[PDB]
Amino acid sequence: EEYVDQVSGLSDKKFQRPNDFSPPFRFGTVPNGSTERNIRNNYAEMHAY
Amino acid sequence: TGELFFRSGFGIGMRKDSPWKQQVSLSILKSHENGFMEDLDKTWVRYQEC
Ligand SMILES: N[C@@H](CCC(=O)O)C(=O)O
Numbered sequence: 001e002e003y004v005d006q007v008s009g010l011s012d013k014k015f016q017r018p019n020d021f022s023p024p025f026r027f028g029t030v031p032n033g034s035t036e037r038n039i040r041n042n043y044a045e046m047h048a049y
Numbered sequence: 050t051g052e053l054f055f056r057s058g059f060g061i062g063m064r065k066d067s068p069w070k071q072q073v074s075l076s077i078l079k080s081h082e083n084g085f086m087e088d089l090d091k092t093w094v095r096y097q098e099c
Pocket residue numbers: 032033034035036
């Protein structure tokens with residue numbers, strides 16, 4: 001047999017609507033970088049979460 | 050079969066005394082941060098039929 005991934009990427013439902021499930025998915029990053037600037041310009045609610 | 054070697058990417062060739070050589074490099078980096086080149090990748094390069 002072969003396992004499968006839990007998510008499909010940054011465009012998954014768990015990253016866009018975390019409150020619509022079980023106790024919410026916990027994801028974060030370290031600020032003051034380039035990934036934070038990339039996420040902030042493309043996703044606002046996800047950036048705040 | 051095998052791994053990758055001589056990893057180099059594709060580019061747009063332009064002559065040295067070209068006025069457009071600065072505005073093209075600022076448009077490719079801008080299309081990599083807004084998701085413009087991933088629509089072009091999933092449309093022509095990524096329907097894996099078999
Ligand atoms: N390489 C990033 C920092 C590390 C990261 O954001 O993943 C920068 O120079 O801003």
